Design a protein around this nucleic acid. Structure first.
Ligand SMILES: Nc1nc2c(ncn2[C@@H]2O[C@H](COP(=O)(O)OP(=O)(O)OP(=O)(O)O)[C@@H](O)[C@H]2O)c(=O)[nH]1
Ligand SMILES: Nc1nc2c(ncn2[C@@H]2O[C@H](COP(=O)(O)OP(=O)(O)OP(=O)(O)O)[C@@H](O)[C@H]2O)c(=O)[nH]1
Ligand SMILES: Nc1ccn([C@@H]2O[C@H](COP(=O)(O)OP(=O)(O)OP(=O)(O)O)[C@@H](O)[C@H]2O)c(=O)n1
Lengths: 498, 1198, 16, 21
RNA sequence: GGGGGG
RNA sequence: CCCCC
């Protein structure tokens, strides 16, 4: 293996792959534990590295090499006397899981060998390697599933504590199954998350939630809107967008599942923002978040602003992506509008109309399209011909820095006297980077929604909302780091405070 | 007393009197400042008000000196001239003054308590006017002004010229200088508080304006119009007005050339040979003429009213193309002082790097395939400007994959970091660090790559980089807004290295790259002379504004879609830290994820485009950490403009196919891009080419770049080095003799004096009167650098002066009890400027014992060992041969002081300072070898090349030094130049023997060697005139360069030798292609012992293509053979003239009997070709017959 | 003769 | 009734490869 | 900070 | 060390 099972099995406890109690197999893995004590010993000799990584890969992996100046070759001859004693039929194989969380815990010295080897890569499914693999099937208990109809006695399905481990999908408490049917001689794998399948529009849909099934009140047949606020924080859809998710989707099957490890890169860009929050060397920390319209980002960042407020204790501002859009509709005629912070927060309320929605309503009436069905009926060429006209009404506001121009809007708001020190600003597309400012942090935010279905769901704006979504989506390639909402809440727990 | 009345001033020749007289005067200027103030403000000078004379073309002008009242009466400092934002997180958004406002220096103070917002700002402005202003190439700024004004005295032999009153009117206040710079504090220091704050920069303005007068661009009358234009710009902000007006006052020439109508110009051919003159009309196309109207109303406003009439004078009077280039060169030195521009870093940071969207937005590609994060993988455009570029670049994707597979990228990345270190990577974060002496190397690239070794292959290494802000460095340049560059961390830079390697592969596939390669000769611009000569052409040089701020986030994806398709077909397993593995992947039109194999680089290309944050943080002394808004192009991740070059040429050639579907045949010839500068050539009818010209202007506007479209029938610009009708025009102002960015001023002399030769030879064809530069740069070397600042120890300090005073005088400071060191300042004789590995500066005629003067050297004389011949020439070689004596004539050399000039050269001062540091400062042993032995582990094993290198040495021949094995390089990577530290006491500890060689000097002699007999050839003028080659007939009118005007000696030199060789310059370009000195050190192998050349390949580890270039580069090269007697002619020092010495054999005759039987026939041409270039001043149509020393031939056969 | 004058005279005669 | 295809992103990809007139 | 050439 | 983006 890469990571050594024997020194610390707790990592493979997370995947639910347990060592067999203790044959060629058992004698083999004890050899691998000796090699990792050896490779760690050579590590410290030269700044934590190896010396001839292609020379070690020939000895350990292929087994075709025998070694007999003393200064440079002393480490190799010590390796050769060890491996030659094993009398193996062939060389040992290197193994690596597909999961990035497994890769982030691999020792530095193993990575040096990997480039001169051909590692056997075990594919995962949802953060879980398939158990049919040749190596995992020999070294670890093969997990056995127990469902509704599948529940039975051990005698009906021949099983031993040696060979097999039990997974519980029945949904009854594990203490009952362990105590009632005599399964206390087997070890149960445990899963702290959930994998919930939903009925979608286009087809069946799956999902992953970072919360335990007891803490999530959803059961079979539940409505999507019930407990919707919990899913938006901790859920991840795992199907290609667009999905089938709707306001009226229902649950089919719910099972315990492994927790999703937060992305290593997404935590890095967010902690870069938190480093600017704590230190006094920076005057303004400002996070920028883009999302496709209709993702509900304003619903999530209203709470994420409060969670950050409890930590640092500073008053955190918040500006919805339509804050400038409504404020431009009010003060376009007034010559010297107020830029005071709380006055702009007063105009962020949903009841007011954005300026951009007004100009887009005329552009649809100019072709006479007020119906969702008439808009869906159009060819892609007919829509793209219109979105170029919407690009003209947008460049008019970004072209220059004027008193009513958008760049001066975020300048006077950010540099106002009473404005909060830390801000959280939303934006609709990448081209707004020059306007909203001035930051080293920017992230995309992917909720669990079909935003093009969510726009058809809402009945107020109708076509004007769905049309602006595609006009923003056309100008918003995913060129910045992606961030699911749970990783932002995970970002705050890991960072130390004070 | 003084310099305008010297015997050297009237005869311009050295003698036993005037040369010893001109030494006493210049040494008196550099040594004592009290004599300098009396020189610059002398009472005998007469003030000038109205003045009259001739302009650049001989027309009579009448101008009047006018100093604006606002410099004599500076306004009190105004706090509101630098407003802040209400939060005071930064300067206020809109603000007028990015540079200095002019104000009285005594009006600026800060009463505020320390550690306050307003206290730190006034401390910054005090840091502004007292620090940023001083930028001097040599010594004090007052000595630099003396060398220029001293040159004007000797050249015109008169104290009375207009430029002097500008010095006496501005800078004469009190008994002493208004301000002096102290090297110890690196600050200007004001002795008179009433002076205007901007004045110290104007000393650099007069030093530039005084250079143009010696240069012959500006005459005494046009100098008055120039100086008023700068003093007019001193109100209210000296640099803001220059950056605003500079675009308008240089661009007028288009309309003035329109009025010349007919003109006759040489016609170049494809091969860079002139085939004839041609009478072409210079009338502009109608659409160019309509643009003149908008300029006139604009030139009547922003321009100075008197300087505006000067340009109206130019559009009227000039009647030939040479007159227009003379008025144009005159305007060039009136619109620019040539100084480096400087501000507070955060003041200029606003408008330079802040992103700006202009005209249409860029739209996204459709996403054909995506990562489980929904990152892009491969993508394609349905429509837009991005589809236009993809219709072109998509045909190159497959062929590049076959070349990407061949490179072993881990060997490339380790070699890529070696080319440039230190890289200013962020310093060590925390304890220990182990270390522990690696902090001495903490600022480096290869050292930081070596320290982080086990970290290299970890994927986590990349995400650690994302938490590090990108520090912003500022690299200033002449006559331009201050630039904001972004330095990057190793791993942060590494993410873009894979896209870069694909980016430079395209250059082999096209001729569209102006950055392809450059030779530095006239062949660099050689294609431009061809297209400017052609009929029915519409030239277009489209400069593009911004490009840092003009590339929005969505614009960069046009380049990514090209790399992503190339990385898709490429098969490069384990690029590191990455694998060629499977992946779960989402496709367009399929519901659930599919399973697609992925190679290593296609991950690294995807991950880099997926995460993009161009924001450049900067830590400032006022506002803390400031961060520029996102949307910049970083300039540059990995490399650029290789991003822009693939981006622009795809937007342009793809527009040609966009017109193919539209049915319009696309007239066009060739197109070069550096970038970001573009250049086009349209051949066709006047109506059709304009229609295609407007399309290229519009398509770039559609992709978000705004440009100033330039169009002309008879002129073009590239690399700010323009051509008109096959006539090169130089830029004089861009070379700044008197300023530099680093403020690196140090007394080491071969570093500085040999650097000055690189400048004066770069001005050879950018100037109208080269002979004036020789008198200018002599006095600069005769005054600015005559002292040496070596620190002595108190023990040995008394022993040195007891002997050296016999020849070279020096400064004697009283011994200081307080500290250990007692300083000395070493004055040197003027003779050191002319000796080998001294200044090697061109010399004036000397006086022999016979009384005949030696030949007057020109700008074309070679340097290197050839300069030693001047020693023998003083002894009269023509007399040396008739007596058959090799005697050196040491007595006469003691007069001029050559005997003392070589004593300073025998110290090897610059070699001991290097050796003394190498001992202690580099621990080597386990400290350095442990990283080199580790650093080898990442490279594709292995380079044992030292075993293949010393194989060439024994026996074998010596080779030096570093062409391979950069694991001795990180020792050099710690220069420890700042400071010299305490090791200087050990640097002179070895000099205790070097003042033991001065007591051992006794009577001193100049050493000679048996190889030194080669100098003894001297030519005797014959009678028959040389029939002249045809090129002179075509260039005889409307000359192709400022110093090649008809009858000028620079023109006549091209007439005798002719133009540069075709196949020789294309081939010599290739030995510089591998380099990105190796040629000559390896060429002795090709001549003496040829069998070492094969191991010469494996010692350098050159590839099979690199092996055949050096073999092929010795083919057309060996026709002029090897140098047993070497010379150094810079390719910039020449430009048009032939480089091959064989060209000069035609105009000299040799007796047959001097040849060796089958050897060295080709060596006499170097004796001839080097001699004709040395003296083109006295050359007048005479064939030459050389004579040889009888002992020279005995040496050649031995 | 000045050098330039000699140079010019030489140039003219060859090219008449 | 609705299809994965009517979504704008889906429609756009298609437009990416049977580009119609 | 990187690229082009002496 | 110069030229150039
Ligand atoms: N029934 C109905 N509710 C609507 C409609 N439009 C908006 N809503 C309300 O909007 C709420 C959802 O908020 P969000 O998903 O954050 O929408 P948003 O605030 O505009 O945020 P963005 O979509 O990112 O701009 C729902 O709870 C609804 O009450 C509509 O047309 N019909
Ligand atoms: N006080 C003062 N210092 C000057 C002046 N000019 C230059 N300096 C610098 O200040 C330092 C001390 O000043 P001085 O003793 O007057 O130096 P100096 O008269 O210019 O003599 P030199 O340094 O040999 O040129 C010197 O190292 C100079 O570099 C000046 O006019 N007055
Ligand atoms: N040392 C530097 C500085 C920056 N860049 C390039 O310089 C370009 C910016 O050119 P700049 O002179 O700042 O803008 P312009 O004046 O408009 O350039 P030009 O006149 O040549 O069009 C950028 O594309 C960047 O890639 C570079 O490669 N080398």
């Amino acid at each position: 293996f890469a990571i050594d099972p024997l020194k610390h099995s707790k990592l493979y406890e997370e995947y639910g792959l347990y060592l067999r109690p203790h044959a060629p197999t058992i004698r083999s893995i004890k050899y691998a534990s000796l090699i990792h004590s050896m490779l760690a010993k050579h590590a410290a000799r030269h700044n934590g590295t190896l010396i001839n990584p292609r020379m070690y890969a020939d000895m350990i992996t292929l087994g075709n090499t025998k070694v007999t100046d003393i200064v440079t070759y002393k480490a190799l001859t010590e390796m050769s006397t060890l491996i030659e004693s094993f009398r193996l039929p062939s060389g040992l194989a290197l193994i690596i899981f597909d999961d990035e969380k497994y890769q982030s815990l691999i020792p530095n010295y193993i990575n040096q060998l990997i480039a001169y080897t051909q590692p056997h890569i075990i594919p995962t499914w949802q953060g879980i390697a398939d158990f049919s693999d040749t190596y995992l099937r020999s070294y670890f208990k093969r997990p056995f599933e127990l469902t509704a109809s599948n529940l039975a006695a051990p005698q009906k399905y021949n099983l031993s504590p040696m060979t097999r481990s039990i997974f519980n999908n029945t949904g009854r408490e594990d203490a009952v199954i362990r105590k009632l049917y005599g399964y206390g001689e087997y070890v149960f794998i445990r899963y702290e998350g959930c994998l919930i399948t939903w009925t979608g529009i286009y087809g069946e849909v799956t999902m992953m939630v970072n919360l335990s099934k007891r803490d999530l009140g959803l059961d079979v047949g539940d409505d999507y809107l019930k407990e919707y606020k919990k899913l938006l924080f901790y859920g991840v859809i795992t199907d290609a967008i667009p999905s089938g998710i709707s306001a009226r989707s229902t649950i089919m099957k719910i099972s315990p599942h492994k927790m999703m490890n937060p992305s290593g890169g997404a935590l890095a860009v967010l902690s870069k923002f938190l480093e600017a929050v704590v230190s006094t060397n920076v005057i303004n920390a400002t996070l920028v978040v883009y999302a496709e319209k209709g993702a509900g980002k304003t619903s999530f960042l209203s709470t994420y602003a409060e969670q950050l407020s409890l930590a640092s204790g500073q008053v955190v501002g918040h500006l919805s992506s339509d804050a400038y859009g409504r404020w431009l509709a009010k003060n376009k005629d007034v010559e010297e509008p107020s830029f005071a912070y709380d006055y702009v927060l007063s105009l962020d309320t949903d009841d007011n109309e954005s300026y951009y929605e007004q100009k887009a309503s005329e552009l649809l009436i100019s072709h006479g399209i007020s119906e969702v069905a008439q808009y869906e009926l159009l060819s892609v060429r007919k829509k793209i011909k219109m979105m170029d006209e919407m690009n003209e009404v947008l460049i008019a506001q970004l072209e220059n820095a004027d008193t009513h121009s958008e760049r001066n809007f975020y300048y006077m708001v950010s540099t106002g006297k009473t404005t909060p020190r830390t801000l959280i600003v939303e934006g609709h597309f990448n081209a707004q980077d020059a306007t909203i400012a001035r930051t080293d942090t920017t992230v995309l935010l992917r909720t669990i929604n079909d935003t093009t279905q969510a726009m058809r769901d809402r009945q107020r704006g109708g076509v004007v909302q769905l049309f602006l979504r595609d006009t923003y989506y056309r100008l918003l390639p995913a060129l910045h780091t992606t961030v699911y909402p749970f990783e932002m809440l995970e970002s705050i727990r890991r960072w130390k405070w004070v | 007393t003084k310099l305008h009345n010297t015997i050297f001033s009237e005869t311009r020749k050295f003698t036993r009197e005037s040369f010893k007289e001109i030494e006493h005067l210049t040494a008196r200027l550099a040594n004592d400042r009290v004599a300098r103030h009396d020189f610059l403000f002398n009472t005998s000078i007469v003030l000038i008000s109205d003045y009259s004379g001739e302009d650049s073309n001989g027309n009579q002008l009448q101008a009047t000196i006018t100093i604006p009242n606002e410099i004599i009466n500076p306004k009190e400092y105004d706090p509101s001239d630098y407003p802040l934002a209400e939060d005071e997180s930064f300067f206020k958004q809109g603000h007028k003054y990015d540079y200095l406002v002019t104000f009285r220096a005594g009006s600026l103070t800060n009463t505020y308590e320390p550690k306050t917002k307003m206290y730190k700002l006034h401390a910054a402005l005090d840091k502004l006017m007292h620090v940023k202003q001083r930028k001097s190439r040599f010594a004090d700024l007052w000595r630099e002004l003396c060398a220029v004004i001293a040159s004007l005295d000797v050249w015109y032999q008169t104290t009375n010229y207009p430029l002097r009153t500008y010095v006496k009117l501005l800078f004469h206040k009190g008994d002493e200088f208004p301000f002096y710079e102290s090297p110890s504090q690196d600050r200007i220091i004001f002795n008179d508080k009433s002076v205007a704050s901007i004045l110290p920069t104007f000393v650099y303005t007069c030093c530039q304006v005084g250079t143009a007068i010696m240069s012959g661009i500006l005459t005494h009358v046009e100098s008055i119009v120039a100086m008023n234009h700068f003093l007019h710009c001193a109100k209210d902000s000296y640099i803001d007005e220059k950056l605003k007006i500079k675009g308008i006052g240089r661009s007028w020439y288009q309309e003035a050339l329109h009025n010349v109508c007919q003109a006759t110009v040489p016609v170049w051919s494809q091969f860079n040979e002139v085939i004839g003159h041609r009478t072409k009309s210079t009338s502009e196309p109608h659409f160019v003429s309509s643009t003149f109207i908008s300029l006139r109303a604009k030139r009547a406003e922003l321009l100075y009213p008197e300087f505006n009439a000067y340009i109206n004078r130019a559009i009227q009077l000039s009647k030939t193309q040479n007159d227009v280039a003379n008025y144009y060169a005159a305007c060039r030195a009136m619109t620019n002082d040539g100084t480096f521009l400087a501000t507070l870093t955060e003041l200029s940071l606003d408008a330079a790097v802040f992103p700006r969207i202009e005209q249409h937005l860029v739209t996204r590609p459709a996403v054909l395939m995506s990562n489980t994060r929904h990152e892009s993988l491969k993508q394609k455009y349905t429509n837009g400007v991005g589809s236009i570029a993809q219709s072109y670049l998509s045909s190159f994707t497959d062929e590049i994959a076959k070349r990407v597979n061949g490179r072993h990228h881990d060997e490339a990345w380790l070699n890529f970091l070696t080319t440039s270190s230190p890289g200013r990577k962020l310093t060590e974060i925390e304890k220990l660090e182990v270390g522990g002496d690696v902090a001495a190397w903490s600022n480096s690239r290869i050292v930081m790559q070596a320290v982080f070794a086990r970290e290299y292959r970890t994927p986590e290494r990349i995400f650690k980089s994302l938490k590090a802000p990108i520090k912003l460095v500022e690299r200033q340049q002449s006559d331009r807004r201050q630039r904001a560059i972004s330095g990057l961390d190793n791993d942060r830079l590494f993410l873009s290295f894979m896209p870069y390697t694909i980016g430079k592969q395209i250059y082999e596939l096209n001729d569209n790259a102006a950055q392809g390669k450059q030779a530095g000769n006239a062949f660099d611009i050689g294609e431009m002379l061809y297209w400017t000569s052609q009929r029915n052409v519409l030239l277009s040089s489209i400069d593009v504004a911004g490009m840092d701020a003009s590339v929005t986030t969505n614009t960069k994806d046009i380049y990514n879609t090209f790399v992503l398709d190339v990385a898709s077909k490429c098969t490069v397993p384990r690029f590191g830290p990455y694998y060629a593995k499977n992946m779960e992947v989402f496709e367009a039109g399929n519901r659930q994820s599919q399973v697609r194999y992925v190679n290593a680089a296609w991950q690294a290309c995807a991950l880099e485009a997926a995460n993009s944050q161009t924001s450049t943080s900067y830590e400032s002394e006022i506002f803390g950490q400031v961060k520029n808004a996102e949307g910049t192009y970083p300039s540059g991740r990995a490399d650029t403009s290789t991003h822009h070059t693939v981006l622009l040429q795809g937007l342009v050639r793809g527009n040609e196919l966009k017109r193919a579907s539209d049915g319009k045949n696309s007239c066009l010839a060739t197109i070069k891009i550096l970038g970001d500068d573009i250049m086009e050539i349209f051949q066709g009818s006047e109506s059709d080419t304009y229609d295609h010209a407007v399309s290229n202007a519009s398509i770039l506007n559609e992709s978000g770049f705004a440009t100033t479209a330039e169009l002309s029938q008879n002129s073009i610009v590239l690399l700010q080095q323009l051509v008109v009708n096959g006539t090169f025009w130089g830029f004089a102002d861009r070379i700044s003799l008197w300023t530099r960015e680093d403020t690196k001023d140090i007394g080491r002399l071969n570093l500085a004096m040999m650097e000055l030769n690189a400048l004066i030879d770069d001005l050879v064809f950018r100037v109208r009167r080269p002979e004036g530069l020789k008198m200018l740069g002599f006095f600069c070397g005769a005054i600015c650098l005559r002292r040496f600042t070596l620190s002595v120890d108190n023990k040995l300090y008394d022993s040195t002066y007891n002997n050296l005073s016999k020849y070279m005088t020096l400064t004697k400071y009283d011994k200081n009890p307080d500290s250990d060191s007692t300083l000395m300042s070493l004055i040197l004789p003027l003779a050191w400027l002319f000796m080998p590995r001294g200044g090697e500066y061109p010399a004036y005629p000397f006086e022999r014992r016979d009384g005949t003067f030696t030949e007057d050297e020109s700008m074309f004389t070679a340097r290197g060992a050839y300069k030693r011949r001047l020693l023998y020439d003083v002894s009269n070689i023509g007399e040396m041969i008739q007596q058959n004596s090799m005697a050196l004539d040491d007595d006469l050399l003691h007069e001029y002081g050559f005997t003392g000039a070589l004593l300073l050269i025998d110290l090897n001062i610059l070699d001991l300072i290097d050796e003394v540091k190498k001992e202690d400062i580099s621990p080597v042993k386990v400290s350095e070898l442990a990283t080199s032995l580790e650093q080898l582990g990442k490279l594709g094993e292995r380079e044992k090349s030292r075993r293949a290198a010393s194989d060439l040495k024994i026996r074998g021949h010596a080779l030096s030094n570093d062409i391979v094995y950069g694991y001795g390089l990180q020792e050099k990577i710690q220069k420890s130049a700042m400071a010299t530290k305490e090791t200087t006491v050990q640097s002179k500890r070895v000099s205790s023997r070097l003042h033991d060689v001065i007591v051992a000097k006794r009577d001193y002699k100049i050493s000679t060697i048996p190889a030194d007999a080669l100098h003894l050839h001297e030519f005797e003028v014959e009678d028959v005139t040389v029939d002249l080659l045809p090129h002179a007939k075509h260039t005889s009118y409307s000359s192709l360069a400022y110093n090649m005007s008809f009858g000028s000696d620079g023109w006549f030199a091209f007439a005798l030798l002719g133009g540069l060789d075709r196949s020789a310059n294309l081939l010599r370009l290739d030995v510089a292609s591998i380099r990105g000195p190796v040629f000559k050190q390896g060429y002795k192998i090709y001549k003496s012992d040829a069998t070492l050349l094969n191991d010469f390949f494996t010692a350098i580890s050159a590839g099979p293509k690199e092996q055949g270039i050096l073999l092929r580069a010795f083919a057309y090269y060996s026709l002029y053979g090897n140098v047993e007697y070497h010379y150094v002619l810079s390719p910039r020092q020449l430009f048009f003239l032939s480089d091959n010495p064989v060209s000069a054999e035609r105009l000299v005759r040799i007796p047959p009997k001097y040849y060796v039987s089958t050897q060295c026939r080709a060596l006499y041409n170097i004796f001839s070709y080097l001699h004709i270039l040395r003296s083109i001043a006295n050359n007048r149509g005479k064939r030459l017959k050389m004579v040889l020393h009888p002992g020279l031939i005995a040496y050649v056969r031995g | 003769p000045t050098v330039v004058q000699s140079r010019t005279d030489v140039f003219n005669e060859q090219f008449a | 009734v609705q299809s994965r295809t009517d979504v704008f992103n889906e429609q756009f990809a298609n437009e990416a490869l049977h580009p119609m007139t």
